[PDB]
Every structure is written in structure tokens, then in C-alpha cells.
């Protein structure tokens, strides 16, 4: 079955190392990627070995790399170890990649994931010089179908001077209407247009990305996997953590805070995430919504048992088995699933009309309710702050969980202060962990603290952490949000000095 | 001319001590007031007198206060002073009512001022026993005609038990018109309503809030002035940063990253907002519009010289001789005003789909750029986040205006890391100092250093950034987003300790050499 079906088009079909030939270096690239699906595959590979021989022939070969958020091992991961990327935004995972930004060998900067498009069009990227984007499809009229996400597509196919796109064979052809693509103005030069989104099940668009076939410099035919997520399953900790959730909806839902329907969801990946989601198949919430960013294992269980009604998000980040099974079952999950651009899944306008529920990890809070997403030792970039800012502010409960030590015991998650703050006190309402549930809803900083030590904090932390507080609360400048500055940042110094931040 | 133009509600009209003993110890009270204006006067200060009379006698007298943002001497003055609260939110500039939360005396939450109304609703503050409002005017059919601002009054019209009135005689009554309030649903139970906002000038409601006539328990007739902060005369310090400011506004309207009429503009008060609008007022853009929380002096003469078309706010800012002013031209200021709930003209939908332009102060950036808007050291409230994070994040333009130092100079404004943050680097692309502007955009942490460093920092402190930031290169636990923790907030610490953060030279200091 032939994927491209504009008999035009397959004119420009060409070799990946042919096509690379039109990315020159200082080039800005857009190209579609999202929670490691979705993104350019061979053309990236061949690009990266060409910087490779240029950079040995004393040659320049970088780009300026801006995707929907992370990719692969076969675009960040093949360009990082070519060291071809002087700048990347807005979301990385791979280790490569993360490794050159921490050294300083990439600029990057995490803009919120619902921000990118906007920021693009306003020009702070930057001029694009070629947009790279992966098809399932190209329609009879020359729609691009993306494939496993949406993400920035359809900004960058709209911005750059020249596109490529890659044909995967790989990827399922009825992935095909599964997308909703708007043509509206939610990015563009203002006044923006109102997204008419008044409930998670809704499509305002089509199932094609929108180009100029002018435009489209060259198709590569390719046939390449998606980069999967882990199927190992939630420990004990993850668990707990789920089970005071549940419980804390059990509790909004009886004194009517929360429909027996809860509002739509919001969640993340990974093992809390999961358990969460395997809480949310068997708990006593029925059709239930997902409004999210990604749609993971957890959610097409749900989707399947009938617990959860619909699922909007960007993209999809499956482990091999829940590819699998989606694959084989596509038409039933089809029905059921709607992929947005980023820039309308994470619009803060539309999160708040809909009153989502934010549910997301973190590396660490303080006592007072402040978040570090990205930035170890407020230093070290782990992944990004991606959608969480977005729906952190824009939710209508905002919540972030966390086991309550990380390293084995070796790092505390609660702090006296955060190291690096991404969503101030104001942008969260809810700690959950192994430990228990704080609920600040109304509280001052100093009553924060008071909830967070005593729910949240691990035992080992916990009298380390009263004690810093009190003695602050004795000693500091002001009394509104105690602090010690002399040690403040220590149990951070600490780690770093001694692989630990338990005292001798 | 009688304000109460229901005749029914006259019965309810009592003293301010009355309707002051309607409030129980423990109370919730929501009122009006924002940036000092539209607050209530006379039945604060009753409340006052009678908690300080029960305190002296051993009994407990305390309310929650929340209200729009800021209020005036007659109400967090007289009630902090006779330590009448036990918990305060969302803003608050008087300085009584300062030193009660900075000493833990009053418990403080500055929640964003767009989100206030929805987390009443969702009973974040407790249930709301009264709700007590400033009036112009009682209509007709009675509705209530707010005063000098909207701030949260519908909603906390909606959700007390019981509500007093203060209609003030001292507000002009050609006030009556000028608001736009909302049936719609924007902060109440999910899902909302779209707020069908796409233009500034936009009125989508009516002049009045709306209130069950049964909850009404007392309406006190009052005469007493509103807090008009002196005008604030720009500096050559707020001259630089205004003149940078349009420069680069210049400079963006002739790359066609913004048009000749730039981007509907919000601004707060003081010396460098009045100087960016005072020279907005003289420069080469026309057809300007306001879509802001604030009206202050410098909106009116560009409302009055044709410069600015129109403002949309949720309060007004006045001097004293700006309140004179439209007090005796109402009638032409009413049809280029237009106040709002502040949950509207706050809404980040509706500030995001504007593509407004955010222009705030701070207290201080850390070379990262992020932004301090509320704590000094990190722990001392000085007002509150307010508004700036609801502009800040969801603008077009996110834009930051200071003084490069404090304190006659013994702080600086840019420091290795900030004590406290509010706005973190994403929510912030443009820096203006007294010494030049850096803009951010598209660039990550180390290169946002390079530009705030140079462009911004004062040359009594740059070397020291300098110094700290390539320490903090060499040896950092990661190098994305260099930091010396063991030094991070040492400046604080040491104007902590000595009054200033310029080093002694009785000591090292690796800037020196
Ligand atoms: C913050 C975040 C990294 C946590 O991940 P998580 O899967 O929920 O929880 P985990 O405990 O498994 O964290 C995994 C990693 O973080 C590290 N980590 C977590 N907390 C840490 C801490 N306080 N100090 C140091 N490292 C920490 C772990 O060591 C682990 O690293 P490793 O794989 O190299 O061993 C993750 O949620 C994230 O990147 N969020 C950013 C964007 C986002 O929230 N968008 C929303 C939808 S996806
Ligand atoms: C941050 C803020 C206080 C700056 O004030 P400003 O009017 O622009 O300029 P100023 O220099 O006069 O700041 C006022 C006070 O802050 C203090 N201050 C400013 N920077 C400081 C710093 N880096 N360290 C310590 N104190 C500082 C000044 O001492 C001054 O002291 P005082 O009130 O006791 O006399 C003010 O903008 C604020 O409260 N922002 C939050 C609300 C907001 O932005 N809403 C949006 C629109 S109005
Ligand atoms: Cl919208
Ligand atoms: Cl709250
Ligand atoms: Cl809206
Ligand atoms: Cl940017």
C-alpha cells in the first residue's frame, strides 16, 4: 500500500544523505518529535555522520535543533555524539544530548512545551531554515499525516524555507484520523483566535498537517522504530503514593469538591505516573478524562475497560507491549484517542476552562512548597520542565509527587530550599509521597512547611528538616518564609562534598 | 441626589459601628479594594475600635481577610494596628499590615490576583461569612455600582452569608457606567465559560454586581477619600530605563516584530512605570492601548492627548491631581475606561490571546534571570506577587524594569542567585536597567548570564558576577546552569551581617585580583 498517494509528490522522493545536504550549518531545524515518538530518523543519522568528516576537516557543522519536546537516540542521541548542535529546545532525554548541555556543548533552554510554537512564530529561534518531519501518509491532496505525535509540525512546516519529509513505513498506517489539526490562529500574530475547546473529546480540525508542496525539498522513504518506554511496573513506594491520591479523590469527591467523575486528567510517565493510572483502572471513578500531554500504557487500559472515556493529549509514549496492542487493535482505540498540536493540548487557556486535574513528578520540593522539575544540585539538567509549568498554573488542582528520598536514601526529595525553583508555591496545592499527603490549600508558607515536614518528609529527613525550620523561624530576616541563608543550600553542598545528605 | 435608588434596601442603611458588629470573631470577610481603591473606609475602623477594646479585655478578635489586591489606611492600617487578622491574601502595600506578616503575627498567602475568585469559589479561604463592599450607587432594581475598582467584589458578593454596603458619597457618581462585570462563569465550578474577549476595548457585561437582596444586612453611608499615592515624579535613574525601554520598542517596530500601535500594554505604578508611560506619551507609536490592572496618571494624559485609545484595568491608581482630574471630566475619562473583575483582566486566556505586553518591577534577578518580586533576603515580605505572574507568563513580551542597585547602592539588583523566586526564567525575555537592556530571547541560562551581566548590572557589582559566574563555570555540579552553592546566597547573607554587599577589602574577594 503505497503511502504517498499524491503521485506528484513521490518526484521528490531521495536519499536520506541527499536530502541531509540541504541542512547547512548555523541552520535552524524544526522537526516533529514528542515523548520519544514521532521524530526524523534517517535524515538526522546522515547528518550526523557528515559533521563527523566535516568537523575533521576543520569544518563547522552544527545546528540549532527545535522539536515539539524529546526524541530518539536516532536524532539527539546520533547529532549529540557528532557534537552537531550548538542550540537545542525545547525538551531532551537522551543521555548523550543531556551530557553535551551540561557541559556547556549545547545551548539549550526549556521553554514551556505550550509556549514553543508561539516563541517560534514570534522569531526567537530564529529564522527556520528547514523543517524535518515524519509522515505516516501524504494524502491524494498532499496532507502530511503525522505519525506517533503531534507536536510543533504544523508551526515548523508553516515556518521554514524548506521541508523534508520522512515516510515511515513503520509506523501504522491507520494512525491516519487519529490526529486533530487546527488551522486557527493559537500561535500566530495576535489577536489570537478563541479555541473553541469546551470538553476533552472535541476536534476543531483535521487529520492532515497543512504545506505548500512548493515548500517540500525532498521525501525519504524510511523504516525506523519510535523510541519505547520501559515496561517495568510501579514498586511499593510508587504504590503508596498512588494510594494516598486515590484516597485524597475519594475524600474531594464525597464532600462534593470533585464530580464522581473527577475533572480531566493530567499526568506524566514513569513509574509513579503508572501507578497512579493502574490506581485510577480499578478505583470508583467512573468515565473518566484524559486531558494530558502524552498517552501512556496506563491510559489505554482505561480507555479499554471503558473507566476512561477519551484521552486528548500530543502524543503517545507506549512500552513494546501497549505498542503492540494498540497496533492490533487501532480502529477500537482510534475512537477513542484525539493527538492535538502541543500548542492546544498544553494551552493554559483551554487547561483552565476544562479545570484539569495537574498530576506530575518532581526532583525536589522545599519546606515551603517550591518545585525543582529540571536541575539537580540546581545545576544539572536532568530532562526539562516541558508541560509541567503549563499545567501546574493552569490546572484546577495542581499536585506533585515523588518518592520522598531519591539515591537510595542518599538525597532527601524535601529540602530547606530548593535548589533550582520551577513552579513556585503558588502553582502547587498538592505533595504526595511514600510518606503521606499534604494539602495547602489557604495555608501560608510557614503553615506549608508545618504540612510538608510532617506528611511528605522521609523519617530520616524529618527532624533535620523541623529543626532547620525552627531555627529559623528564630533567626531569619523576616519571619513571613523563615530561612537560614547560611545553610540553606548545605544539605545541596553536602551531597556534592560527600555522596550524601545525611550528616556524619 | 440619593444614591440608594431602591427605596426597600433605605431600611438597611445603619452606622458603620452597627454594621461593624454584623462581623464575629473568626469571620472570613471579603471585600473590595485594589491598588488603594474602591476599598471600605468607616466600617474598618468601627471593627478596629471595638477588637481593640475586646483585646484589652482578654477576648479574641480576629478576622481572615481577603480582598481584590491592596487596600488603604482605614482598613489593613486600622486593622493591623489593632491586630485584628489572623490571615490575610491575596496583596497588601500597607506597611502596619506589612510588619504584622513579617513579624508572624498576621499569616499571608499572595496568591496570582487572576486566580483569587476561583479558589474562594473552591473554598481555598474557608467559607465566606461577610462580604463587605464600597458602593457608588444602589440602582433601581438593586444593583450594586462598585466604586474606583472591581477587583473580586462579584465574587465574594456571591459567596458570603451575609453582605454590608458602604455607599461613599466621595466617589463621583459618573462612575456608574464605567464597569463591565460578568454573569459568565469564569471562576466558578469546571468547565467554564470562554470569555469571549478579543479586543481590549470589548465590554461583554453590565454596570452593576449583582447581589440576592436578602443577604444585604447593612448598608452604612460613608464620605471619605480613597488612598491616592502622591505622584511619584520620574527620576534620571526611571529616564534611563523608560528610554532604553522605547528604543528597543523601536527597534522591534522596525523589524516588524511589532506594529507602529505596539501590543496592548500593561504597566504597574511608580517612578518607572510613570516614566515608560510618560514616554510613551511623547514617543512615535500611536493608537496605544491599555490592557492592564491599573489606570495611573500616565494613562489618563495618553487617554486625553489621543495617544491611547483605550485602557481596560480592574482599578484605578491615582494622584491625588489625577483624581481631580477625572473627577471633573468623568463623562469624556468613562468612555476610554473600562474596569473589569479581576479575574478577567487577569485571565491569562484572554492576556495570551491580547498578546499583551508585561512590563514589571522586581525586587531583584539572579544572573539567570530569574525574578524576585516578593522577598527581600528570601524571607521578608515586602507586597506580594500580585498580578505580575498572571502578565508575566502569559504576554507576548515579558519585561522586567529596576534600578541596578538598592539601598543607596549597598544592594544590587542582579545577583548570583536570588533569595526567593516568582518568576522563573522562562517567564522572563527582557531585562532593563538603569544601565541598558538585555534581551533574552532564545537563549539558554549561560548565555542569558553573558547579556544580564553585561547590559544590566551596575559596574559596582558586574566584576563580582563576572567573577562568580566563571568560578561557577570551572566548578559547578553541572555546567547548564553554573552555581557555587556554598557562595549562591552570600551577598544576602552578608547584607545580612554588615548593611551591604559590597565586600570590604579588609578581606579576599577573587574580583579583586
Ligand atoms: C522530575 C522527573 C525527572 C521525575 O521523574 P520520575 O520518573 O517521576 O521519578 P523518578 O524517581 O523515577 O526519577 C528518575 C530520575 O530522577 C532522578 N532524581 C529524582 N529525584 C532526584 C533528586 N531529588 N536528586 C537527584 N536526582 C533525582 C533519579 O535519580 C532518576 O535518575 P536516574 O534514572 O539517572 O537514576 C520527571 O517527572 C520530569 O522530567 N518532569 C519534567 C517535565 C514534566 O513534568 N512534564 C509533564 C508530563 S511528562
Ligand atoms: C518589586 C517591587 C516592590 C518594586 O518596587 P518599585 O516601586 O518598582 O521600585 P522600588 O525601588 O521603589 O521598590 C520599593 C521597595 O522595595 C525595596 N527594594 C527594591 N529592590 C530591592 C532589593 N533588590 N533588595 C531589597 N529591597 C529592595 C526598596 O527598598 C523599596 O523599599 P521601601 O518600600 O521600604 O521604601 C514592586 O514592583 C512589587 O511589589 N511587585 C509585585 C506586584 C506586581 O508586580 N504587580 C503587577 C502590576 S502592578
Ligand atoms: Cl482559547
Ligand atoms: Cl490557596
Ligand atoms: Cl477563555
Ligand atoms: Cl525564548
Same mark, same amino acid.
Given at each position: 500500500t503505497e503511502r504517498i498517494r499524491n503521485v506528484a509528490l513521490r518526484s521528490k522522493v531521495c536519499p536520506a544523505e541527499t536530502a541531509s545536504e540541504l541542512i547547512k550549518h548555523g541552520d535552524v531545524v524544526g522537526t516533529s518529535g514528542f515523548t520519544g515518538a514521532g521524530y526524523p530518523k534517517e535524515v538526522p543519522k546522515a547528518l550526523a555522520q557528515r559533521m563527523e568528516a566535516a568537523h575533521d576537516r576543520g569544518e563547522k557543522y552544527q545546528i540549532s535543533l527545535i522539536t515539539g519536546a524529546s526524541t530518539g537516540p536516532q536524532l539527539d542521541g546520533e547529532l549529540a555524539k557528532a557534537n552537531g548542535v550548538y542550540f537545542r529546545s525545547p525538551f531532551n532525554t537522551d543521555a548523550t544530548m543531556r551530557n553535551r548541555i551540561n557541559a556547556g556543548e549545547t545551548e539549550y533552554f526549556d521553554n514551556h512545551l505550550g509556549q514553543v510554537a508561539g516563541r517560534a512564530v514570534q522569531g526567537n529561534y530564529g529564522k527556520f531554515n528547514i523543517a524535518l518531519v515524519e509522515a505516516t501518509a501524504i494524502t491524494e491532496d498532499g496532507g502530511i499525516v503525522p505519525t506517533s505525535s503531534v507536536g510543533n509540525s504544523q508551526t515548523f512546516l508553516n515556518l521554514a524555507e524548506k521541508v523534508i519529509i520522512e515516510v515511515n513505513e513503520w509506523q501504522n498506517p491507520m494512525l491516519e484520523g487519529i490526529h486533530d489539526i487546527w488551522d486557527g490562529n493559537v500561535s500566530g500574530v495576535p489577536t489570537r483566535d478563541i479555541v473553541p475547546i469546551v470538553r476533552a473529546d472535541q476536534r476543531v480540525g483535521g487529520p492532515v498537517?497543512?504545506?505548500?508542496?512548493?515548500?517540500?525539498?525532498?521525501?525519504?522513504?524510511?523504516?525506523?522504530?519510535?523510541?519505547? $518506554?520501559?515496561?517495568? !511496573?510501579?514498586?511499593?513506594? %510508587?504504590?503508596?503514593?498512588?494510594?494516598?491520591?486515590?484516597?485524597? @479523590?475519594?475524600?474531594? /469527591?464525597?464532600?462534593?469538591?470533585?464530580?464522581?467523575?473527577?475533572?480531566?486528567?493530567?499526568?506524566? /510517565?514513569?513509574?509513579? %505516573?503508572?501507578?497512579?493510572?493502574?490506581?485510577?483502572?480499578?478505583?470508583?471513578?467512573? +468515565?473518566?478524562?484524559?486531558?494530558?500531554?502524552?498517552?501512556?500504557? &496506563?491510559?489505554? !487500559?482505561?480507555?479499554?475497560?471503558?473507566?476512561?472515556?477519551?484521552?486528548?493529549?500530543?502524543?503517545?509514549?507506549?512500552?513494546?507491549?501497549?505498542?503492540?496492542?494498540? +497496533?492490533?487493535?487501532?480502529?477500537?482505540?482510534?475512537?477513542?484517542?484525539?493527538?492535538?498540536?502541543?500548542?492546544?493540548? +498544553?494551552? =493554559?487557556?483551554?487547561?483552565?476552562?476544562?479545570?484539569?486535574?495537574?498530576?506530575?513528578?518532581?526532583?525536589? $520540593?522545599?519546606?515551603?512548597?517550591?518545585?525543582?522539575?529540571?536541575?539537580?544540585?540546581?545545576?544539572?539538567?536532568?530532562?526539562?520542565?516541558?508541560?509541567? &509549568?503549563?499545567? %501546574?498554573?493552569?490546572?484546577?488542582?495542581?499536585?506533585?509527587?515523588?518518592?520522598?528520598?531519591?539515591?537510595?536514601?542518599?538525597?532527601? $526529595?524535601?529540602?530547606?530550599?530548593? $535548589?533550582? /525553583?520551577?513552579?513556585?508555591? *503558588?502553582?502547587?496545592?498538592?505533595?504526595?509521597?511514600?510518606?503521606?499527603? !499534604?494539602?495547602? #490549600?489557604?495555608?501560608?508558607?510557614?503553615?506549608?512547611?508545618?504540612?510538608?515536614?510532617?506528611?511528605?518528609?522521609?523519617?530520616?529527613?524529618?527532624?533535620?528538616? *523541623?529543626?532547620?525550620?525552627?531555627?529559623?523561624?528564630?533567626?531569619?530576616?523576616?519571619?513571613?518564609?523563615?530561612?537560614?541563608?547560611?545553610? !540553606?543550600?548545605?544539605?545541596? *553542598? #553536602? @551531597?556534592?562534598?560527600?555522596?550524601?545528605?545525611? =550528616?556524619?
Open positions: 498537517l497543512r504545506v505548500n508542496p512548493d515548500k517540500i525539498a525532498a521525501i525519504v522513504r524510511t523504516n525506523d522504530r519510535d523510541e519505547n $518506554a520501559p515496561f517495568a !511496573a510501579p514498586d511499593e513506594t %510508587a504504590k503508596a503514593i498512588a494510594g494516598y491520591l486515590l484516597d485524597f @479523590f475519594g475524600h474531594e /469527591v464525597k464532600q462534593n469538591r470533585l464530580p464522581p467523575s473527577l475533572l480531566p486528567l493530567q499526568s506524566g /510517565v514513569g513509574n509513579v %505516573a503508572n501507578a497512579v493510572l493502574e490506581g485510577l483502572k480499578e478505583g470508583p471513578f467512573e +468515565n473518566l478524562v484524559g486531558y494530558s500531554e502524552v498517552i501512556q500504557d &496506563g491510559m489505554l !487500559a482505561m480507555l479499554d475497560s471503558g473507566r476512561m472515556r477519551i484521552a486528548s493529549a500530543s502524543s503517545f509514549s507506549l512500552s513494546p507491549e501497549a505498542a503492540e496492542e494498540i +497496533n492490533n487493535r487501532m480502529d477500537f482505540f482510534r475512537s477513542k484517542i484525539i493527538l492535538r498540536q502541543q500548542d492546544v493540548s +498544553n494551552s =493554559p487557556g483551554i487547561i483552565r476552562r476544562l479545570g484539569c486535574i495537574a498530576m506530575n513528578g518532581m526532583i525536589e $520540593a522545599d519546606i515551603y512548597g517550591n518545585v525543582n522539575s529540571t536541575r539537580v544540585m540546581g545545576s544539572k539538567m536532568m530532562n526539562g520542565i516541558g508541560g509541567s &509549568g503549563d499545567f %501546574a498554573r493552569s490546572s484546577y488542582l495542581s499536585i506533585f509527587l515523588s518518592p520522598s528520598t531519591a539515591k537510595g536514601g542518599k538525597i532527601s $526529595a524535601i529540602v530547606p530550599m530548593a $535548589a533550582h /525553583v520551577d513552579h513556585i508555591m *503558588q502553582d502547587a496545592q498538592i505533595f504526595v509521597t511514600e510518606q503521606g499527603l !499534604a494539602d495547602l #490549600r489557604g495555608l501560608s508558607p510557614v503553615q506549608r512547611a508545618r504540612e510538608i515536614i510532617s506528611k511528605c518528609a522521609h523519617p530520616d529527613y524529618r527532624p533535620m528538616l *523541623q529543626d532547620y525550620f525552627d531555627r529559623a523561624l528564630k533567626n531569619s530576616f523576616g519571619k513571613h518564609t523563615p530561612h537560614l541563608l547560611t545553610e !540553606a543550600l548545605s544539605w545541596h *553542598q #553536602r @551531597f556534592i562534598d560527600t555522596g550524601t545528605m545525611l =550528616p556524619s
